[PDB]
Structure formats: structure tokens, C-alpha cells
Scaffold this active site. Sequence first.
Site, PDB file in Angstrom:
ATOM      1  N   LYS B 211       0.977  -1.380   0.084  1.00 51.03           N
ATOM      2  CA  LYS B 211      -0.134   0.073  -0.004  1.00 51.03           C
ATOM      3  C   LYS B 211       0.914   1.219  -0.163  1.00 51.03           C
ATOM      4  O   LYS B 211       0.716   2.219  -0.815  1.00 51.03           O
ATOM      5  CB  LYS B 211      -1.169   0.025   1.253  1.00 51.03           C
ATOM      6  N   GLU B 217      10.542  -4.525   4.675  1.00 51.57           N
ATOM      7  CA  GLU B 217      10.496  -5.876   4.490  1.00 51.57           C
ATOM      8  C   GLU B 217      10.476  -6.244   3.023  1.00 51.57           C
ATOM      9  O   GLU B 217      11.133  -6.900   2.135  1.00 51.57           O
ATOM     10  CB  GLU B 217       9.456  -7.011   5.203  1.00 51.57           C
ATOM     11  N   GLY B 272      -5.154  -2.580   4.664  1.00 53.55           N
ATOM     12  CA  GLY B 272      -4.239  -3.689   4.216  1.00 53.55           C
ATOM     13  C   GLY B 272      -4.864  -4.947   4.401  1.00 53.55           C
ATOM     14  O   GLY B 272      -4.927  -6.004   3.555  1.00 53.55           O
ATOM     15  N   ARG B 273      -5.385  -5.145   5.673  1.00 47.77           N
ATOM     16  CA  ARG B 273      -6.122  -6.464   6.138  1.00 47.77           C
ATOM     17  C   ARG B 273      -7.392  -6.524   5.717  1.00 47.77           C
ATOM     18  O   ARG B 273      -8.265  -7.548   5.912  1.00 47.77           O
ATOM     19  CB  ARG B 273      -6.217  -6.411   7.634  1.00 47.77           C
ATOM     20  N   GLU B 358      -5.535  -7.382  14.393  1.00 49.88           N
ATOM     21  CA  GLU B 358      -5.084  -5.766  13.830  1.00 49.88           C
ATOM     22  C   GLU B 358      -6.146  -4.968  14.088  1.00 49.88           C
ATOM     23  O   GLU B 358      -6.050  -3.700  14.218  1.00 49.88           O
ATOM     24  CB  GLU B 358      -4.486  -5.884  12.791  1.00 49.88           C
ATOM     25  N   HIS B 389      -5.908 -34.145  17.244  1.00 52.60           N
ATOM     26  CA  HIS B 389      -4.733 -34.736  17.817  1.00 52.60           C
ATOM     27  C   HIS B 389      -3.741 -33.723  18.061  1.00 52.60           C
ATOM     28  O   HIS B 389      -2.479 -34.268  18.275  1.00 52.60           O
ATOM     29  CB  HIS B 389      -4.422 -35.598  16.744  1.00 52.60           C
ATOM     30  N   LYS B 519       7.028  -0.191  12.187  1.00 59.12           N
ATOM     31  CA  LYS B 519       7.947   0.284  11.280  1.00 59.12           C
ATOM     32  C   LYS B 519       8.849   1.443  11.542  1.00 59.12           C
ATOM     33  O   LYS B 519       9.413   1.968  10.502  1.00 59.12           O
ATOM     34  CB  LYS B 519       6.761   0.551  10.046  1.00 59.12           C
TER      35      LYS B 519
HETATM   36  O1  LIG Z   1       0.260 -42.517  16.592  1.00 56.78           O
HETATM   37  P1  LIG Z   1      -1.094 -42.956  16.672  1.00 56.78           P
HETATM   38  O2  LIG Z   1      -1.309 -44.194  17.415  1.00 56.78           O
HETATM   39  O3  LIG Z   1      -2.006 -43.012  15.444  1.00 56.78           O
HETATM   40  O4  LIG Z   1      -1.830 -41.669  17.386  1.00 56.78           O
HETATM   41  C1  LIG Z   1      -1.715 -40.434  16.676  1.00 56.78           C
HETATM   42  C2  LIG Z   1      -2.223 -39.206  17.690  1.00 56.78           C
HETATM   43  O5  LIG Z   1      -3.817 -39.285  17.883  1.00 56.78           O
HETATM   44  C3  LIG Z   1      -1.463 -39.012  19.009  1.00 56.78           C
HETATM   45  O6  LIG Z   1      -0.302 -38.420  18.880  1.00 56.78           O
HETATM   46  C4  LIG Z   1      -2.054 -38.185  20.186  1.00 56.78           C
HETATM   47  O7  LIG Z   1      -2.199 -37.009  19.848  1.00 56.78           O
HETATM   48  C5  LIG Z   1      -1.217 -38.560  21.576  1.00 56.78           C
HETATM   49  O8  LIG Z   1      -0.075 -37.966  21.668  1.00 56.78           O
HETATM   50  O1  LIG Z   2       1.158  -2.716   2.443  1.00 55.01           O
HETATM   51  P1  LIG Z   2       2.091  -2.231   3.056  1.00 55.01           P
HETATM   52  O2  LIG Z   2       2.211  -0.635   3.035  1.00 55.01           O
HETATM   53  O3  LIG Z   2       3.402  -2.624   2.668  1.00 55.01           O
HETATM   54  O4  LIG Z   2       2.139  -2.580   4.788  1.00 55.01           O
HETATM   55  C1  LIG Z   2       2.138  -3.818   5.019  1.00 55.01           C
HETATM   56  C2  LIG Z   2       1.548  -4.283   6.363  1.00 55.01           C
HETATM   57  O5  LIG Z   2       2.276  -3.380   7.394  1.00 55.01           O
HETATM   58  C3  LIG Z   2       0.091  -3.643   6.322  1.00 55.01           C
HETATM   59  O6  LIG Z   2      -0.733  -4.492   5.380  1.00 55.01           O
HETATM   60  C4  LIG Z   2      -0.562  -3.963   7.730  1.00 55.01           C
HETATM   61  O7  LIG Z   2      -0.813  -5.267   8.014  1.00 55.01           O
HETATM   62  C5  LIG Z   2      -1.861  -3.371   8.017  1.00 55.01           C
HETATM   63  O8  LIG Z   2      -3.006  -3.908   7.436  1.00 55.01           O
END
Ligand SMILES: O=P(O)(O)OC[C@@H](O)[C@@H](O)[C@H](O)CO
Ligand SMILES: O=P(O)(O)OC[C@@H](O)[C@@H](O)[C@H](O)CO
Lengths: 557, 557
Positions: B211, B217, B272-273, B358, B389, B519
Site C-alpha cells: 500500500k 521487508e 491492508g487487512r 489488528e 490430535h 515500522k
Molecule cells: O500415533 P497414533 O497412535 O496414530 O496416534 C496419533 C495421535 O492421536 C497421538 O499422537 C495423540 O495426539 C497423543 O499424543
Molecule cells: O502494504 P504495506 O504498506 O507494505 O504494509 C504492510 C503491512 O504493514 C500492512 O498490510 C498491515 O498489515 C496493515 O493492515
Amino acid sequence: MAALTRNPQFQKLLEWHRANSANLKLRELFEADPERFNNFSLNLNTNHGHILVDYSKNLVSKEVMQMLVELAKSRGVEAARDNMFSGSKINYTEDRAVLHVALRNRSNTPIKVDGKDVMPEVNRVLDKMKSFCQRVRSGDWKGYTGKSITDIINIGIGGSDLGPLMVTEALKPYSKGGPRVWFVSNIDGTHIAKTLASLSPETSLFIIASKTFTTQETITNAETAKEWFLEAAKDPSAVAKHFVALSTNTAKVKEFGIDPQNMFEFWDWVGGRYSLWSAIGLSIALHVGFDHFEQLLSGAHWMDQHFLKTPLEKNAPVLLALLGIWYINCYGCETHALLPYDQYMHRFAAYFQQGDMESNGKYITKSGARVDHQTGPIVWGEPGTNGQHAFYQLIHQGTKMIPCDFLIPVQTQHPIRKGLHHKILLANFLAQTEALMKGKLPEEARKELQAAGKSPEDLEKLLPHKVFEGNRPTNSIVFTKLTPFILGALIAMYEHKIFVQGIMWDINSFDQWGVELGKQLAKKIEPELEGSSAVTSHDSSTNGLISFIKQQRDTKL
Amino acid sequence: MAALTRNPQFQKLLEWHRANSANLKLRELFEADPERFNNFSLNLNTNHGHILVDYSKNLVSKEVMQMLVELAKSRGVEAARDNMFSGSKINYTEDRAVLHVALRNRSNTPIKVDGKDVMPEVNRVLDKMKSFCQRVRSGDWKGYTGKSITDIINIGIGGSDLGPLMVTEALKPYSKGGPRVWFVSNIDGTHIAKTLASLSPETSLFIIASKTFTTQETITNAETAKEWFLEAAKDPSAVAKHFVALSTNTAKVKEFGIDPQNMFEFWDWVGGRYSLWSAIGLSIALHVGFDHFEQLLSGAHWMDQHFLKTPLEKNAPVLLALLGIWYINCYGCETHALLPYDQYMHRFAAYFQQGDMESNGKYITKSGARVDHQTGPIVWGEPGTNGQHAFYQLIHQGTKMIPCDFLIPVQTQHPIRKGLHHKILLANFLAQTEALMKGKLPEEARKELQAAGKSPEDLEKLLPHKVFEGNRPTNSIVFTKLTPFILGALIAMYEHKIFVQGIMWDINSFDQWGVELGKQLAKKIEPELEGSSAVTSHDSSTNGLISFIKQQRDTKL
Ligand SMILES: O=P(O)(O)OC[C@@H](O)[C@@H](O)[C@H](O)CO
Ligand SMILES: O=P(O)(O)OC[C@@H](O)[C@@H](O)[C@H](O)CO
């Protein structure tokens, strides 16, 4: 009440907070004591890089830290830690040891469960992983048409997904000479469908990751992958060249079509959310190589030893735990933000959402009494600097107190433009915590508005909007470079933070009974969705949603 | 005090909450009244699919909803909305209109700012986007060596990144015949470096989205991209074939060296958002095609008209907003979870993290008063079923009250295995909110443990851990299919929710003075990082962290 609230060190802490916390101002704390950074930070030398844990921008005095350390001691943290490390069955609701520390026990000092040293079997499976990694990475392991494997696909959910995904993402620069890695986790058919679309059955190897090997999501995804594979291969015997298992169900693994020689075992004392260090980390080892996987384990081992040997007052995971207790149980902060200034770490927060929240999102103590205090926080975050543009508005000028951990490597994996990008990244990392602490005073904003040529009327109106209250506490965690070793140490540090908090709350960090009800109700609903018949067996909302689904599923848009 | 807390209807609401809220039990509310789903849901027919907003699993009665609607009227929601739509300068701190609704005003009814219709310029830019998309997508637009464009790279941060990213991810099935799309946003050199490693300067088109066109950045990333490009092309005239700009700042775009005909304009009244609907959406339109972009705009327009013309009591964004006020200002819930049961929607929660936080992470009101109540919540989430999970343990059995929005399309884009995956996904979507509502009573858990064959001892030990207290309120938002149109409607719905909450809190949803400070922050630290000299200019933490960076940056790992 509960163990924590009945504890006199906790009662003293809470009373001190009630009387004094309004006197705590970060600005004043730093102004009053030039040794503040020195006294409220830990510069850890791992011999493979430094990890600086700077907790000085926190709303704590020497006296508060002393009270917090005394509470950790009087809640049995030191004894509980030793019991974990020695193989005591500290997962009391399931009667299991808790031994992720054994998986990375590089010293090979015996750790017994039921009188038997677990290290031989840990090391046997690690040897098997290493051999498999050689076979695949070298190209010696051939697919059904005789071609080298180019793509590895992990199929798993939760603990069988997040660790491998986060770590391979974080350690991407260490993956030269490794196969591409893909992670399928959601039952949503979009996930497997979009993955398979860009793959060849001839050169793709699937890793079926499941502690239980019964998780509906993972098995369904696995069976879909096998169907897709067999369409091309037309030979059930070819499955053994393209499917391996991370589990213990030898029969079901063989029944699936996987060579029992290609089942990589782990044990009941490996919690899913603590499993990346086990056979579950096979996709990591394949992607970055076994040497790098060992380095990852060694970093975790270093941190385990730091946690085990260090007096609590200078013990990194303990101090992080204690600051969290302070903000949770005294200030009442619901959340904890993890903000890595590192794109490779983009899944670090999501990983600790499981690690922290599935561990400590609990309400029943060891005695069986309900807690009458807060337990685990809601973990969240996105990498910097992006957050500064997204949600830092609320952190700076909202109505929530939000403890934040800022994390960054000193050295970047990509020092493009003579380090220009990383210079800017570092500057933002530093300026943000500085700004969160300091804010901006009316006198400061006033002069800026006057210089900008604002009329007296406009200045008066704008002024309060431009003021930042500050006094927003942060941790800054800075480390030499995000290597496999350093990443291992950092993950382990948060693992032990979570453990300490759980002990202090008197909860079981290592079970997960809270997933049962949703699973039960889903099994009941599944068959009801078939056909056009009305569903009346639930509450009117559930019924109404099902009705909508049945009505809308044939509509042409 | 503040407008909300001074409001008699709010104090009435809060007093009622104090006296009566503990008597609201979801299980009992559903049992007592079979019409509950019917009385607390909205089935919206857009003529391009239905959106069912089922708010029946909330801790509300007819009386609660009546009071909330009365509060909305008392807070002047309808008048404020009309002012937004008419082009009044409701962003009062910046003296700007707030006209994302103009961007998608398909009716072309004049909307005036400073006595001038904005629609001709909105449509002129849209026509320019349409023409550009045709040229690129058809292969007609050629790079500097005469090849068709294969890759488009959006460079932007925050509002100039998250929308395009989220929408292209959500609408992936609609991208056949479009170029690959990449998003670069972080200043972290990893982001641009790993993107450029996969690209050819001959076939890559960069889109500089900003904008202001001054964000550090974005301009740094853009300059890095240009340097990389010119190292290959070696001709400044070639830049016009490979770089376009999306901005309000003609002069800064010219300065950077972009063709005046390569600039896609938007306006100061586009936050922006709230900007994906503008020129900022060019990467969407290139990826999925202009027709699909128009459908996205049209969906938003439908929802705009819904918001504008519907009585408050049946107005979807208003009701969502009011339920939020109820949970935030009466129950004190810090967070709001967005849980889409859709992998394509995997960046939806992150998007509204910005959009919501924001906008409403504010503490000064229109009158200049500091709020003495809560404002915007912390927004978070991951797509289901993965969430189940990861962190649902805490939602079911933690100590936090967490309002959740569950979202799902009835029709999947990938009906693989004859719809088996989607059946399971739907079953989980439905069961989870049923489970959160119902819970599991001690006696119900007791019977289950008894049937399992547990001894009196084991049963008693396990019982409390198996109890689900339930009464956890959710919204279920179900829609025919996630088409461009329906996605547009859904995003606009939450935009208007955010608007209504902001008006009720008497805050400015449309500035971001916290973001603007950001900024201004890193500029002082940047030059201090260069060189080996010790920095003593800041607080001891900032100094100490800088010392660590300087000490650690030459270490060999
Ligand atoms: O590894 P399995 O037995 O598929 O289970 C996957 C998840 O449900 C498990 O990691 C759960 O989040 C407990 O840590
Ligand atoms: O679009 P410019 O001006 O680079 O700004 C980037 C962000 O800082 C801006 O989008 C901010 O998230 C406000 O909504």
C-alpha cells in the site's frame, strides 16, 4: 482444594503478587539495576553453540524468582524429574514410564523399566533406522520398476506427524542428497489427493506412522495410498518395496503388506507428542541423514543433562516453567505466544500446541481432586517479522497480557546480500521486545505529533492513540545457529518446561483422556451419514446439521 | 469510563450474566426444547449455495439474544454500518473512508468519497487486472528471453501477503491453467532465497504488493529480487516484463523503477487487512483466473447486502459479533478459535488472526477514553481433524473457556474413495461440537469403566480423569461447497463481525498505530549491529542481546 493452592510457598507467592505486582514496572526494574540482564539470563555453552535464555524483560524481581524456585522445590520438581529419568511409572493413570529421554540417551547409561535396561532396544532400532537410511539415500533400495526412491511420504496424525514435519522444515538446509519429504495427516481427502497428484508410484515410499496402528485417520490414508499404488503396480508383493511402518503391530503390519523387517518399533513409554526422537523420526533421518539425526538427539541429550544436573535457580527449562506459573497462576494469562524470527521454524508453534496443550490441558490432580486453579495455557504464534504486521497490534495496544518467547539464530542459513536481510531480521527481533517493555510516553508521542505539523486540535485528539503503555514482558531466546544439535536442545528445553509446570500443577502431563469422547461420538455418526433417511438420534443441532448435509450434498453449483 | 461500560443495556446484560449464567446448561437446554436448533440458526440461501450458521450450541437463551440485539441497537450499529457503506470517514484517527465494500460493489451503485464516486476507478483497476490476467495466463505475455511466464511471485507482508496466500491456498482446485504462485513476505533471507532457488529469471513474474511502497521487508525483498533478476537479464528495460506493483504510491513505485503501466492502483480507504478484494488480489486472479476472482468479489457482495439489509436478530455477522461480546465482556474469554474442517482452508485462521486482532486489538475509544473492558480476542486455530490430535485435549479438559467456530463444506473438492474420507471428516466435525456440548457425567463414565471390567480400585482411580464437564459452546458454520463465491461470502461475514464488535466497543477497527510504531522501531538498532564495538545505548537486556549476537556470529558450526 488442590496440591498447588494448598502449598504455603504458592500462597506466599500469590499474596506477594496481590500486594506488590502493581509496583512492578519493567522500565524501573532495568533503571534501578544495571546488572539486571546479567542476573536474569543464562548463557548456556553446549560446546556446539551457545543458547542465551534472556528472561530479564519479565515482571520479576530477585525476590519473586526466589519464591518461584522455592515453590518448584516444595512441589517436588527435583524428585519428580529424577523419577522420570530413572524409569519410574510417573504416567500414573496409564501406569507407564515416561522415557523420551532414553531415546536420545547418547551416554548409554542404563535406564531400567521393570528391571530391564531399555537402551539395547533403543539402540537396536536406531541401528535399523541407520541401515534403512543408507539403503534409501544411496539409491540401493529400489522401487517395483527398479528405480531409486525420490520421494518419502509420512502418513500419520498428531504426534506421528507434527514433530517430523516441524523438524524437516526447520532443518531443510541439511537435506542435500536426501529424498523429498511429504507429510499427509488430515483425513480430509484433499490432503492425500493433492500429495499423490505430484508423485510417481515407481519412486515413492510411504511411511505409515502410528503408535497404536488403529487411528482411523492414518489407516484410512494408508489404505488410500496402497490402493493408488496397486493401481499402477498391479502386484501385492510390490507393496513391501514401497511401504514401511513405525509401530509394533507385527500382524496388522504384515497383513497390510509390509515386510515385518520394515517395522520400526517404539514403546509405550514414548508419548506421541514426545516421539520424534524414536522410530517416529525416520522421515527426519531419511531427509537430513542419520548423522544429522544423531546430532538432533545429542542436542536433546545435552539439554536433558542440563535439566538433570543444574541447580533449579540456574536451570533453563525450570526458569521458563516458573515464569509461566507466575503469569498463569498469578496474573491469569490464558495464552503463551511463541514467536520465532525464523522462516524454517514456521511450524515450531504448531508443534508446541500439541506438546504443551495436550500435555497440560488437564483438570484432575494425582489425588483425583479437581484443580481449583489454572493449568496449561493456549499456545500460539507465527514467525517474525510477519506477526509485527498481523497481530502485534493487539500485543502492543490491546487489553490482554500475553507472555511471548522471541527466538532467533545469530547466524542465518542464507546470508544473502552480505547479511543484509539477517541484519534487518535481528534488528526487528531486538526492537520489538525493547518496544514491548518500554512503550512510548505521552511526552515522546506529543513531540512527534508536533513535528509532523498536526494542529493543536488534531494533536490533542490523536495523542492517546499514539501512546504505548509498554510493560509487556518477553523472553528472548538467542542461539548461535539453528543446527540439528541446537534444534534438538531447544525442543528438549520446552519438553522439560512442560514437565516442570505439570508437576507443579499436580497433573499428569503424559496421558490424553480428553480425546476419547469425540472419538466415541464420531464412530456413532459415521454410518448415519449414509443414505437419505432422517437422523433423529442426537440433539437438535447435531440432527439439524446432518439434515443440512444430506440436503446439500447433491446440489449442483 | 467508556461508552460500552456506561451503556445501561450492557450493565443489564452483565447483571443478568452474574445472576443467571451459571444456570445455563447446554445438555438441559436441548432436552427441554426440541425447537432449539430451529430458533438459534440461520439457513442462508445465496442462490449459489447455502450457508448454515448454527449458533444453537451457545450458552444463550431467547432472553440473552434479545438483550444482545438491544445492546447492538443502543450502541448504534446500524447507523455506523450505513456510514461505512456510504463512504463516511469512519476511520477517524486517519480521517479516511472505510470502503472494502466498494471494491466488490457488483451493483455499481455510486459510493462517494469527498463528493466523488469511487466506482469508476474501482472498475478501471478491475478491468486492468482482467486484461493483465488474460495476457499472462494465455501465455501471450513473454519474459525477457521470449518465453511464457510459468511462476508468479507475490512480495508483500501482512495485509499485502496473508489474503492472497490464504485465498490461493483455499481455491487451489480452481487454479488449473494458471501459473504457479509463490509468496515471499518475511525479511528473513531464507524466504526469498529458497523461493529464488526454484525459479528462472526468464519465466518468473514478480508482484510487489505494498500500500505504502515503503515497508522495509517488502522493498528489501523486492530489491533482492530485482538484483537477482538483473544479474541474469543485464538490461533495466527487461524489468518491465517481470515486475508489477500493487500500491497507492505512484511516486515510490516509479522510484523503485517500475513501469507506470505496470502499476495496479488502490486507495487509502482500503485497509491492508481488508485489501485482497482490490489490486492486492492480483495474484489470486492470476492463479485462479479473473472469472473466479469476480465470483469471490460477488460472494462478498452478497454478504455485504445481507449485512446491510437484514434485521439485526437474523443478521449473521451481527449475531456472531454479539455472541463474541457475550463471551468476551461477560465470560472474560481471552481467545476465539477458528477450526475449519478443510485442508485447503489451512491459512484461514492465520488470516483472521490479522483481520481480527489488528482491527480490534485497541484500547482507546472514539471519545479519547481508555477502555475499562476487554476488546478484541486472541484468534487462533488449525484445521480439523489435525486439531483433535494436537490441542483439543485442552479444549475438552483444560481450565480455559474457548469459544470455537467449526467450519466445513458439505461437498469436498476431492470425493476420493467414493466419499469415504469426507464422510469421516464430516463425522468428526459433528461429533466434536456434540462432545464439547454434552460432555460425560461421572455416572456415565462409571458405567463405561464398569462395562470395561475395571476393579472397584482401578475404576475409582481412573474415574475423575474420564469425566468431561462439557457445556463448551461452539458455532457450526456449514456451507454447500467451498467455491470462490462461498469463500468470498465467508470472509466478508467475518469482516462484518469484526466491524460490529469494534462499533460496540467504541474503538477504531480501521487504524493500526501499534503496527505503525513497529515500522519505526528497528531503524535505531540496525547500524549498531555492524562492527565489533560494544553497544551500551539501550537497557541492559537489549545491550546484552546485541553483545551475544556480536560474540556468536563468527563461530564455526
Ligand atoms: O500415533 P497414533 O497412535 O496414530 O496416534 C496419533 C495421535 O492421536 C497421538 O499422537 C495423540 O495426539 C497423543 O499424543
Ligand atoms: O502494504 P504495506 O504498506 O507494505 O504494509 C504492510 C503491512 O504493514 C500492512 O498490510 C498491515 O498489515 C496493515 O493492515
